[PDB]
Write a protein that binds this ligand. Structure first.
Ligand SMILES: Cc1cn([C@H]2C[C@H](O)[C@@H](COP(=O)(O)OP(=O)(O)OP(=O)(O)O)O2)c(=O)[nH]c1=O
Ligand SMILES: [Mg+2]
Ligand SMILES: [Mg+2]
Ligand SMILES: [Mg+2]
Ligand SMILES: [Mg+2]
Ligand code: NA
Length: 326
DNA sequence: CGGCATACG
DNA sequence: CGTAT
DNA sequence: GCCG
C-alpha cells in the first residue's frame, strides 16, 4: 500500500465503509478544533481503508498500512470488537460537534465564524436568524436557502443545470465549452453542489467570459444568489415538479492552455488533490496547482494537453476520475 | 523535530 | 474572512 | 496523528 493517495486507485464504493466513516468523524472534529495535522492523518487513514481490496476483519490486517498508528488502530480495534468506538460516539453526540457541523454547513460560514458564534452561545439556525445584524449578505443567502441546500443534488438535476449553463455560455461566447467536474465527474450519484469548468479552444477568447455568462443567467431569472472574475459560487433556481429548489453551482473559467490542470484540480477529491500536490513537491520537486506545474530549478512550466500528460510528468500511473475518490 | 495543498472572491 | 458540507 |  503506497503512502500517498495519488499512488493508488480509490473507488467511490468500497469494502470498509463503516471503518472509514468513523475515522472521518474524527477528522471532521479535528477540523472544528483547528487541528489541521490530525484532520489530515485521520483523512489519510480513512482513505487507506477505502483503497483496500476487501474488508478489514482483524487488527493484524492494519500492520504495515500507512497512516495507522496507535490512535487510528485503536479506533478500528474498538469497532471490530464492539461495533462502536466510544470516542467516535462521544464526538457524535457532543453539542460542540453538532453545532459546528450545523453552522459550517451554511454557505458563507466557515470554522472561524462558526466557532465565534458557538463561543457567543449561539446554537441553532433560528438563533442566527434573530440577529441578522451579524450576517454578511452571503451568509443571509446561505441561511435563507439552507433547507434546500441541505437536500442532496441528484444526477438528474445535473443534466438540467448543464443545459442551462451551456445555453448561456453559447450566447456569451460561441464555441465555449462546459465540462462537468467535481464529485459528479468522479461518479457520485449525489452531491452538495454542481461544479462546472468552462473554456474555449482559442487561447485568450475566454477572457472576460464569466461576467457575460452570469449576466445572461441572471437575466433568465435562474440566479437566486451570486457575488456580483473567473470563479463564481452561485445559488441557482432549478425547476422541480410544480415548483423549484435552490441548488449550489460553481463555475470556473480557464484558458485552454491550463484546462488539463484546472480539470484535474476541480475533479478532486479534495484529499486526492492535496496528496497529489504534496507528492509533486516532496517527491518530484515540482509545484502543482490548478493552473500548471512548475519546475523551480529550470523556472519553466510543463505544457500539458491532457490529464494523462500530467500523471506521466509526475511519474504516476494514470487514474481515471472514478478512481480518485480518496 | 518540521511538515502537513492551493488559489480566487 | 469566505469559497472550503 | 503520523511520517521521514
Ligand atoms: C473544497 C475543496 C475542493 N477542491 C477541489 C477538489 C474538489 O473535488 C473540487 C470541487 O469541490 P466541492 O464541490 O466542494 O466537492 P466535491 O464536488 O468533490 O463533492 P461535493 O460537492 O459532492 O461535496 O474542488 C480542492 O482542491 N480543495 C478544497 O478545499
Ligand atoms: Mg462539488
Ligand atoms: Mg463546488
Ligand atoms: Mg510535533
Ligand atoms: Mg465542498
Ligand atoms: Na460553510
Amino acid at each position: 500500500m503506497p503512502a500517498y493517495a495519488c499512488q493508488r486507485p480509490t473507488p467511490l464504493t468500497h469494502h470498509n465503509t463503516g471503518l472509514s466513516e468513523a475515522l472521518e468523524i474524527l477528522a471532521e472534529a479535528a477540523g472544528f478544533e483547528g487541528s489541521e495535522g490530525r484532520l489530515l492523518t485521520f483523512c489519510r487513514a480513512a482513505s487507506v481503508l477505502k483503497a483496500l481490496p476487501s474488508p478489514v476483519t482483524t487488527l493484524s490486517q492494519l500492520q504495515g498500512l500507512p497512516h495507522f498508528g496507535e490512535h487510528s488502530s485503536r479506533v478500528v480495534q474498538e469497532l471490530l470488537e464492539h461495533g462502536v468506538c466510544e470516542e467516535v460516539e462521544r464526538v457524535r453526540r457532543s453539542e460542540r460537534y453538532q453545532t459546528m457541523k450545523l453552522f459550517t454547513q451554511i454557505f458563507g460560514v466557515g470554522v472561524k465564524t462558526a466557532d465565534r458564534w458557538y463561543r457567543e452561545g449561539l446554537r441553532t439556525l433560528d438563533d442566527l436568524r434573530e440577529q441578522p445584524q451579524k450576517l454578511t449578505q452571503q451568509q443571509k443567502a446561505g441561511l435563507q436557502h439552507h433547507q434546500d441546500l441541505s437536500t442532496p443534488v441528484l444526477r438528474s438535476d445535473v443534466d438540467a443545470l448543464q443545459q442551462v449553463v451551456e445555453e448561456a455560455v453559447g450566447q456569451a461566447l460561441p464555441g465555449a465549452t462546459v465540462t462537468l467536474t467535481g464529485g459528479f465527474r468522479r461518479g457520485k450519484l449525489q452531491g452538495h453542489d454542481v461544479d462546472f469548468l468552462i473554456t474555449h479552444p482559442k487561447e485568450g477568447q475566454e477572457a472576460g467570459l464569466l461576467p457575460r455568462v452570469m449576466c445572461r443567467l441572471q437575466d433568465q431569472g435562474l440566479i437566486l444568489y451570486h457575488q456580483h472574475f473567473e470563479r463564481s459560487f452561485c445559488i441557482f433556481r432549478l425547476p422541480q415538479p410544480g415548483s423549484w429548489k435552490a441548488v449550489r453551482v460553481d463555475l470556473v473559467v480557464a484558458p485552454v492552455s491550463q484546462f488539463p490542470f484546472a480539470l484535474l484540480g476541480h475533479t478532486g477529491s479534495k484529499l486526492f488533490q492535496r496528496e497529489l500536490r504534496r507528492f509533486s513537491r516532496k517527491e518530484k520537486g515540482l509545484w502543482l496547482n490548478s493552473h500548471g506545474l512548475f519546475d523551480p530549478e529550470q523556472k519553466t512550466f510543463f505544457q500539458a494537453a491532457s490529464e494523462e500528460d500530467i500523471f506521466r510528468h509526475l511519474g504516476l500511473e494514470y487514474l481515471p476520475p472514478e478512481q480518485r475518490n480518496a
